Nucleic acid binder design. Sequence first.
DNA 1: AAGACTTGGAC
DNA 2: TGTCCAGTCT
Length: 357
Amino acid sequence: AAPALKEIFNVERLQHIASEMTAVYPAFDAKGFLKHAKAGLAELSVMQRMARVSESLHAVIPLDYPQTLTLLYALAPRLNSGFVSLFLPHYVASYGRDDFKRSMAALKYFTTFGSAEFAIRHFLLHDFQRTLAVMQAWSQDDNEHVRRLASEGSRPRLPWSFRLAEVQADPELCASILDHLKADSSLYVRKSVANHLNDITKDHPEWVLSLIEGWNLENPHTAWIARHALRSLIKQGNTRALTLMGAEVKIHHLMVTPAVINLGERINLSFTLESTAPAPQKLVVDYAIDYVKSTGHGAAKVFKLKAFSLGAGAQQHIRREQHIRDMTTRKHYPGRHVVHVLVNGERLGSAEFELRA
DNA sequence: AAGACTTGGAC
DNA sequence: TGTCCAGTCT
């Protein structure tokens, strides 16, 4: 069992920060800084501690914003950890809102030592159009860290940050940023593009599908981004997504018994596949349940049935029992559960069962 | 496999 | 308010 993550900002590390700060700034009020930062340290969460380091430095350094930035630039390469150095972008977000230009410059430099993904989002919150333009430039920088910030900082649903409602509502705003990055060599950037697109599929699935259906997947970097961008839709058995990742059959007697169950009971899916081809076919056969979720909407999950060869004009009966019970990773909600049968990524039929209260 | 499991924050 | 994140494990 690992130590809680707030212990990254423990007193040892505060002392490390004050030591390095004194090396960069001999007149540094190290004692005042440690006193400020330790007050109530125990009851502070990990992100509260990152902020405290920034506030404690600001409270004891008697220099102005540019002069402090000079010391902070020298401090950055001396910190052990990229996580620890989140307080440097945080410092910009706290104290750089009167000097936009210098702040952008400072974020662009600080992000290479850790990440300005959290700090840029305050600027996107309260100064969106100006900040978005900076990022569009950052998406064409030579530094993969800067390019990555362009993608990561503007995500609709960044973990450990508030959602960007403006971005979440309109995927056209950040579209050109992602377009400039859709063939990036950097794995670090490519993850960010994909995770950003994944976020978009939570609210504009059809928009993402069309974008990627316009892409040249001959390019391996682009292909990588597409697979991981579409990963949620894939797991839902989205037909268009499955086509993007890569059958002469008919189906008989598709059914789900019983038609109504209580939680804890079993269902049984069955059908017969028949080939209409003159030669054997490699088939991948899956099914998806539109599970009823908290909202009362459906969210589809795909299970594997069978991957096999069906001879010319042949038949294969398929049967699967599933135990419908609440588990650690899935809670069930009552209502109508549609069940689709997929053959080679195409929906071939649907049945349903009802799960009651 | 499909599910258990991993930080802890947002919703 | 269980799920997700972004995978590792069986």
